[PDB]
Write a protein that binds this ligand. Structure first.
Ligand code: CA
Ligand code: CA
Length: 76
């Protein structure tokens, strides 16, 4: 095995409780930036700023289990 990949909408739930830098049940544009460093993708606040924008199902400031399910839905 090397990189056969295999992550469905079910493996995303864990990605949320696993990328919670603050670990408070939800995340904020502040921690969402570190989540990208875990995968690389070098970018500035110009790309991350919009990442959380459309990533928030209701744009409230943080992403929960729901807003997170859609976040990865259009974020690969
Ligand atoms: Ca948090
Ligand atoms: Ca929200």
């Amino acid at each position: 095995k090397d990189d056969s990949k295999g992550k469905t909408e079910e493996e995303l739930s864990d990605l949320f409780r696993m990328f919670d830098k603050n670990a408070d049940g939800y995340i904020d544009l502040e921690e969402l930036k570190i989540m990208l460093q875990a995968t690389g993708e070098t970018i500035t606040e110009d790309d991350i700023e919009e990442l959380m924008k459309d990533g928030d199902k209701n744009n409230d400031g943080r992403i929960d289990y729901d807003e997170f399910l859609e976040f990865m839905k259009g974020v690969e």
